[PDB]
Amino acid sequence: DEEAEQKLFSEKRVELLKELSRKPDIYERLASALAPSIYEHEDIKKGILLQLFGGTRKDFSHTGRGKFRAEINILLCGDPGTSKSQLLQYVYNLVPRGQYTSGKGSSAVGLTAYVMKDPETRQLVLQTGALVLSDNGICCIDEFDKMNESTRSVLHEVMEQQTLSIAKAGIICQLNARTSVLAAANPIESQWNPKKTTIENIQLPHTLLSRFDLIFLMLDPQDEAYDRRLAHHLVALYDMAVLKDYIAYAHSTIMPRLSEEASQALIEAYVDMRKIGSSRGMVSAYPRQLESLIRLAEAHAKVRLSNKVEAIDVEEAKRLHREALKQSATDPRTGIVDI
DNA sequence: GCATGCATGCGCATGCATGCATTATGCATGCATGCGCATGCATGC
Numbered sequence: 223d224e225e226a227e228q229k230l231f232s233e234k235r236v237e238l239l240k241e242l243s244r245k246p247d248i249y250e251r252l253a254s255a256l257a258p259s260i261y262e263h264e265d266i267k268k269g270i271l272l273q274l275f276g277g278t279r280k281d282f283s284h285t286g287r288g289k290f291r292a293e294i295n296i297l298l299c300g301d302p303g304t305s306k307s308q309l310l311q312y313v314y315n316l317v318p319r320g321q322y323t324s325g326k327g328s329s330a331v332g333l334t335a336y337v338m339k340d341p342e343t344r345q346l347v348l349q350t351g352a353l354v355l356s357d358n359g360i361c362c363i364d365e366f367d368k369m370n371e372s373t374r375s376v377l378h379e380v381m382e383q384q385t386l387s388i389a390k391a392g393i394i395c396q397l398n399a400r401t402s403v404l405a406a407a408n409p410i411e412s413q414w415n416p417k418k419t420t421i422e423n424i425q426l427p428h429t430l431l432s433r434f435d436l437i438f439l440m441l442d443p444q445d446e447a448y449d450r451r452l453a454h455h456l457v458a459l460y461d462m463a464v465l466k467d468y469i470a471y472a473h474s475t476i477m478p479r480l481s482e483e484a485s486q487a488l489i490e491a492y493v494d495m496r497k498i499g500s501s502r503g504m505v506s507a508y509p510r511q512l513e514s515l516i517r518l519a520e521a522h523a524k525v526r527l528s529n530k531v532e533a534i535d536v537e538e539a540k541r542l543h544r545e546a547l548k549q550s551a552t553d554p555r556t557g558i559v560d561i
Numbered sequence: 562g563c564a565t566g567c568a569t570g571c572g573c574a575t576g577c578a579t580g581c582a583t584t585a586t587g588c589a590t591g592c593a594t595g596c597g598c599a600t601g602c603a604t605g606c
Contacts, residue, residue: 331599391597 225474232467239468243527252525255465257312261305261452265545269296269436270313272542273360273402274469275524277517278478289384293402294517295433297366299424300440301413306406310362313404319359321352325368328352330376334386335397348393353380356401366407367425374430381433405434414441419503419557431505435514436546443561478523480516480531487536488515498549503557505547515539 230236242248253267260267277292298306314320323333333351340346353361353376363369380386386397409415409423420439424431431437492512499507518539523531544550552559 329600337598 225470230471235464235467236471239464239471240527242468249525252465252468257309259459260308260312261455262448263305265542266298266309266438269294269438269542269546270309270404271525272518272521273404274317275473275521276402277520291382291384291513292517293400294435294521295381295403295405296436296438297405297407297431297434298438298440299407299409300438301442302408304440306440307364310364310404310406313360314362317360319356320362321356321359322362323352323364325365326370328369328373330370330372333373333376334399335388337390337393348388348395350397353399353401354386354397357398358400359402360404361401362404362406364406366405367410378429414439414559416558420505420552420559421503421557428506432508432510435517436542437505438546439548439559441548441559472524472527476524476527476529478520478531479529480519480523483533484519484531484536487533488512488519491515491536491540495543498554501554501557504549504552504554511543515543518542 249268250264252271253264256267256271273294273296276294279292280290282288282290298309300306310322314322331351333353335348335350335354338346338349376386380399380401381403384398384400386399388395388397407424407426410425411423414423492509492515495507495511499505515536519531519535522535522538523529526535548559551561
């Protein structure tokens with residue numbers, strides 16, 4: 223509501239933020255300022271920040287293609303003994319229009335919309351569910367494995383078309399569900415067994431997996447430095463307004479666009495990804511990953527307060543995509559992660 | 562003693578306060594049950 227009005231009278235703050243944006247490390251600083259009480263996992267926080275900024279909402283109605291998903295969906299797969307749940311809680315508590323669902327607790331009709339009748343008046347034909355209330359917001363799904371196929375059928379259309387179609391007795395309608403999904407998942411054995419491959423560990427259909435922009439495979443390296451740092455931080459546990467204003471300004475004042483250099487970099491990244499993901503055992507690549515790269519590049523361009531996407535943004539997006547899946551350490555011909 | 566006056570007396574009409582006779586039809590509410598819906602339990606393979 224406030225973004226659609228010219229209430230940025232604070233020219234002092236505008237100048238301060240525009241000067242901050244020109245500093246080189248501000249990106250990392252934002253990743254540092256997103257969560258003070260959270261650990262060394264900077265890549266996860268960077269991904270969440272890029273999710274917050276979001277891609278450009280282009281208009282393609284004249285093309286006839288339909289709506290194009292401009293938002294970011296992220297998945298975190300790992301053992302229960304990690305901090306993904308705390309990240310979901312923080313994102314729920316930080317962003318307005320946030321919703322949180324957990325496992326089998328929700329049903330297919332609980333999402334989207336359901337038929338009702340008023341207890342005070344005669345009728346109220348339809349009532350919105352969890353996903354529609356999350357329109358233009360964030361939905362955090364936990365225990366994604368336990369969800370039945372009936373709800374995943376709904377998620378299939380929600381995650382791509384940004385719309386819902388409901389056809390029941392005397393009720394035919396289309397609704398907008400422009401949400402962004404943060405999903406959490408566990409290994410089938412509740413352990414990341416290294417003998418089994420990544421796909422066998424996750425056990426999800428490839429159609430559902432392909433739509434996630436970023437996948438974070440949380441793994442335990444058992445490094446001594448990690449143990450010391452985490453122990454010291456956790457025992458020692460015993461400007462937000464500036465960040466808010468900067469995020470709002472960037473989110474409401476700049477439209478990213480890219481030149482031919484970014485185009486060719488994206489095409490090269492796509493063919494390289496297809497070459498790498500061809501081998502069985504690892505998660506294969508699909509054309510939607512190209513669009514995911516485009517969205518991440520546009521978000522990174524928004525971070526720098528730039529209307530022009532540079533090759534730096536595309537390279538950073540490629541770096542994040544490569545590092546999230548741990549494809550560097552993973553054995554390309556056996557599908558087993560190594561250290 | 563007879564002639565006259567006359568206060569008493571009786572029967573049928575109207576006027577006026579009380580009293581007497583008359584009298585089914587239309588609309589609303591709770592019990593029984595169909596029809597659409599979502600959850601949930603049980604049963605295979």
